[PDB]
Scaffold this motif. Structure first.
Motif, PDB file in Angstrom:
ATOM      1  N   UNK A  62       0.833  -1.210   0.000  1.00  0.00           N
ATOM      2  CA  UNK A  62       0.000   0.000   0.000  1.00  0.00           C
ATOM      3  C   UNK A  62       0.862   1.253   0.000  1.00  0.00           C
ATOM      4  N   UNK A  63       1.948   1.222   0.752  1.00  0.00           N
ATOM      5  CA  UNK A  63       2.870   2.348   0.754  1.00  0.00           C
ATOM      6  C   UNK A  63       3.515   2.514  -0.617  1.00  0.00           C
ATOM      7  N   UNK A  64       3.846   1.396  -1.274  1.00  0.00           N
ATOM      8  CA  UNK A  64       4.367   1.428  -2.635  1.00  0.00           C
ATOM      9  C   UNK A  64       3.369   2.087  -3.564  1.00  0.00           C
ATOM     10  N   UNK A  65       2.097   1.754  -3.409  1.00  0.00           N
ATOM     11  CA  UNK A  65       1.101   2.339  -4.294  1.00  0.00           C
ATOM     12  C   UNK A  65       1.100   3.849  -4.142  1.00  0.00           C
ATOM     13  N   UNK A  66       1.057   4.340  -2.908  1.00  0.00           N
ATOM     14  CA  UNK A  66       1.037   5.787  -2.724  1.00  0.00           C
ATOM     15  C   UNK A  66       2.294   6.427  -3.313  1.00  0.00           C
ATOM     16  N   UNK A  67       3.470   5.848  -3.068  1.00  0.00           N
ATOM     17  CA  UNK A  67       4.701   6.442  -3.602  1.00  0.00           C
ATOM     18  C   UNK A  67       4.714   6.375  -5.129  1.00  0.00           C
ATOM     19  N   UNK A  68       4.296   5.238  -5.710  1.00  0.00           N
ATOM     20  CA  UNK A  68       4.339   5.081  -7.168  1.00  0.00           C
ATOM     21  C   UNK A  68       3.531   6.140  -7.910  1.00  0.00           C
ATOM     22  N   UNK A  69       2.449   6.605  -7.323  1.00  0.00           N
ATOM     23  CA  UNK A  69       1.609   7.619  -7.952  1.00  0.00           C
ATOM     24  C   UNK A  69       1.973   9.043  -7.561  1.00  0.00           C
ATOM     25  N   UNK A  70       3.040   9.243  -6.800  1.00  0.00           N
ATOM     26  CA  UNK A  70       3.530  10.574  -6.512  1.00  0.00           C
ATOM     27  C   UNK A  70       3.306  11.073  -5.115  1.00  0.00           C
ATOM     28  N   UNK A  71       2.897  10.196  -4.201  1.00  0.00           N
ATOM     29  CA  UNK A  71       2.669  10.556  -2.820  1.00  0.00           C
ATOM     30  C   UNK A  71       3.933  10.346  -1.996  1.00  0.00           C
ATOM     31  N   UNK A  72       3.822  10.641  -0.700  1.00  0.00           N
ATOM     32  CA  UNK A  72       4.949  10.562   0.211  1.00  0.00           C
ATOM     33  C   UNK A  72       4.559   9.794   1.464  1.00  0.00           C
TER      34      UNK A  72
ATOM     35  N   UNK B  59     -16.582   4.790  -2.202  1.00  0.00           N
ATOM     36  CA  UNK B  59     -15.498   4.136  -2.883  1.00  0.00           C
ATOM     37  C   UNK B  59     -15.598   2.638  -2.917  1.00  0.00           C
ATOM     38  N   UNK B  60     -14.444   2.004  -3.117  1.00  0.00           N
ATOM     39  CA  UNK B  60     -14.386   0.548  -3.280  1.00  0.00           C
ATOM     40  C   UNK B  60     -14.874  -0.148  -2.011  1.00  0.00           C
ATOM     41  N   UNK B  61     -14.354   0.262  -0.852  1.00  0.00           N
ATOM     42  CA  UNK B  61     -14.711  -0.442   0.380  1.00  0.00           C
ATOM     43  C   UNK B  61     -16.205  -0.326   0.689  1.00  0.00           C
ATOM     44  N   UNK B  62     -16.800   0.863   0.531  1.00  0.00           N
ATOM     45  CA  UNK B  62     -18.244   0.983   0.727  1.00  0.00           C
ATOM     46  C   UNK B  62     -18.985   0.155  -0.292  1.00  0.00           C
TER      47      UNK B  62
ATOM     48  N   UNK C 142      -4.582  11.557  -7.779  1.00  0.00           N
ATOM     49  CA  UNK C 142      -5.302  10.513  -8.474  1.00  0.00           C
ATOM     50  C   UNK C 142      -5.755   9.370  -7.610  1.00  0.00           C
ATOM     51  N   UNK C 143      -5.577   9.464  -6.301  1.00  0.00           N
ATOM     52  CA  UNK C 143      -5.967   8.410  -5.385  1.00  0.00           C
ATOM     53  C   UNK C 143      -7.146   8.863  -4.548  1.00  0.00           C
TER      54      UNK C 143
ATOM     55  N   UNK D  84      -7.819   3.821  -3.195  1.00  0.00           N
ATOM     56  CA  UNK D  84      -8.089   3.221  -4.498  1.00  0.00           C
ATOM     57  C   UNK D  84      -7.681   4.224  -5.553  1.00  0.00           C
ATOM     58  N   UNK D  85      -7.550   3.747  -6.785  1.00  0.00           N
ATOM     59  CA  UNK D  85      -7.065   4.591  -7.865  1.00  0.00           C
ATOM     60  C   UNK D  85      -8.241   5.116  -8.675  1.00  0.00           C
ATOM     61  N   UNK D  86      -8.364   6.437  -8.739  1.00  0.00           N
ATOM     62  CA  UNK D  86      -9.492   7.044  -9.438  1.00  0.00           C
ATOM     63  C   UNK D  86      -9.413   6.768 -10.929  1.00  0.00           C
ATOM     64  N   UNK D  87     -10.526   6.295 -11.500  1.00  0.00           N
ATOM     65  CA  UNK D  87     -10.573   6.054 -12.921  1.00  0.00           C
ATOM     66  C   UNK D  87      -9.917   4.783 -13.393  1.00  0.00           C
ATOM     67  N   UNK D  88      -9.413   3.948 -12.491  1.00  0.00           N
ATOM     68  CA  UNK D  88      -8.782   2.717 -12.931  1.00  0.00           C
ATOM     69  C   UNK D  88      -9.783   1.839 -13.653  1.00  0.00           C
ATOM     70  N   UNK D  89      -9.291   1.152 -14.687  1.00  0.00           N
ATOM     71  CA  UNK D  89     -10.131   0.230 -15.451  1.00  0.00           C
ATOM     72  C   UNK D  89     -10.540  -0.978 -14.612  1.00  0.00           C
ATOM     73  N   UNK D  90      -9.695  -1.375 -13.670  1.00  0.00           N
ATOM     74  CA  UNK D  90      -9.898  -2.589 -12.908  1.00  0.00           C
ATOM     75  C   UNK D  90      -9.639  -2.296 -11.442  1.00  0.00           C
ATOM     76  N   UNK D  91     -10.090  -3.224 -10.606  1.00  0.00           N
ATOM     77  CA  UNK D  91      -9.833  -3.205  -9.167  1.00  0.00           C
ATOM     78  C   UNK D  91      -8.416  -2.750  -8.840  1.00  0.00           C
TER      79      UNK D  91
END
Ligand SMILES: N[C@@H](CCC(=O)O)C(=O)O
Ligand SMILES: N[C@@H](CCC(=O)O)C(=O)O
Ligand SMILES: [Mg+2]
Ligand SMILES: [Mg+2]
Lengths: 246, 249
Positions: free
Chosen positions: B115-125, B163-166, B190-191, B206-213
């Motif tokens: 999850x931390x990787x996801x945030x960093x990969x999209x430009x977060x800290x 979102x996804x969880x709801x 974008x998250x 979750x990733x906004x606009x993603x085609x898939x989960x």
């Protein structure tokens, strides 16, 4: 790229159980077989084996410091201290037989070659170096990997099989990093190569629908610098590509 | 029906004189038991692999937890304190893979480090020490406790609607385990924030606009997943997404 599954070993690392595989095997799949290596966990019957086979284009049964448990070939109990990996045995021995029947290419290396012999009904010498007549086939102790995995004994190709068919020389040198070896050869296996002391060090599965080779040496070692090791990995890769092409 | 092939990220580890690629048993069993998939481990080989060939070969990706921490240079953070555990070979594999997977419509589940990787990969800290920022609880596992205690539920989790969880139907609040010293600082662009710990720490995205989960959670839902329905629901949703992809094969 063909999807080549690589067998994992199990290991407790700190607090947790892990499934592990050696970098050098994975890099040889990339550099030598032209494949995509994905590691097959040692989950035994927890996985649908048939689904696993349908999902891969070939299987590499790796080496390991551990030893096939002797109960699988009705052998004598192992000496105290012997390394075993029961979870790996529970995964690989049924997988070998099922892969060969389903026509999934198989390459077995060292322990994986021993697995192939046991899975088809053969047996092992648990200490080749104490049998008598046979050489000591173990790697030298307290040496870096480059020395341990250097060529150390000759290897004599038996005509008419897979190794001759891929064009390996009649004799070539191989590394040797093993304390166990084939005792009784399993029925239905062709002898592909012999060490100079007569130890069987390569086999193929007779009548197999697809590539089915095991070798006792370690041809993943710096595969790009050994034309003989590379020829074996490239032939395995071509078989996997055939399957991937369907 | 085709079982989906779910790739599970490896960590690197030197064992004796040999380098290895490793993955935790509990993540692999959760893929089998919770997601209904076939887990294969993705080596941390970075650019040595055709990333495009990897994506074509899997029906989904699980970015696992790990004791290691993303190297802070990837989010322009300060150098980590001496002795911090890192895994540069994993970072070189997972950060580009996250982006490429979500772009290509390959289902993604990230757990804890993942999850931390996801945030960093999209430009977060990230905060490198959540427990020292001043406004968060200590999210690390308790020191002198066995695993069954360390991975038990330890704080609440508040779902942000819409979102996804709801959409999975999870309750507005539920309890989760917490085994992490780092956490999200700046959310990536974008998250979508999916859930917050009671101290306000972002613990699911979750990733906004993603085609898939495409979901990441900071807790560790692989732990005893079969007997924890709030964790199982996440793996079931992931597994359904992976099966949809497998059905296009
Ligand atoms: N432990 C087995 C296999 C060795 C290996 O795969 O390196 C032996 O000593 O023969
Ligand atoms: N090392 C990271 C990830 C922890 C984990 O994945 O268990 C942290 O402390 O936040
Ligand atoms: Mg030898
Ligand atoms: Mg937490």
């Amino acid at each position: 790229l063909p999807l080549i599954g690589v067998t994992a070993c199990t290991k407790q690392i700190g607090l947790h159980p892990y499934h592990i595989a050696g970098d050098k095997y994975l890099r040889a799949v990339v550099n030598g077989a032209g494949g995509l290596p994905l590691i097959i966990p040692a989950l035994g019957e927890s996985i649908d084996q048939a689904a696993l086979l349908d999902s891969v284009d070939g299987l590499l049964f790796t080496g390991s410091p551990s030893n096939v448990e002797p109960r699988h070939y009705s052998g004598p109990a192992s000496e105290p201290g012997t390394l075993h990996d029961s979870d790996r045995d529970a995964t690989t021995l049924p997988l070998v037989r099922a892969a060969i029947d389903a026509g999934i290419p198989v390459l077995g290396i060292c322990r994986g070659f021993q697995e192939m012999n046991v899975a088809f009904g053969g047996s092992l010498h648990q200490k080749v170096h104490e049998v008598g007549t046979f050489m000591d086939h173990r790697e030298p102790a307290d040496q870096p990997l480059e020395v341990q995995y250097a060529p150390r004994h000759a290897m004599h190709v038996q005509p008419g099989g897979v190794l001759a068919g891929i064009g390996l020389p009649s004799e070539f040198q191989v590394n040797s990093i093993h304390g166990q070896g084939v005792d009784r050869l399993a029925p239905g296996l062709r002898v592909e190569a012999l060490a100079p002391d007569g130890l069987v060090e390569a086999i193929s599965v007779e009548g197999a629908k697809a590539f089915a080779l095991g070798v006792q040496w370690n041809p993943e070692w710096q595969v790009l610098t050994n034309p003989n090791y590379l020829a074996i990995f490239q032939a395995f890769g071509k078989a996997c590509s055939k399957r991937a092409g369907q």
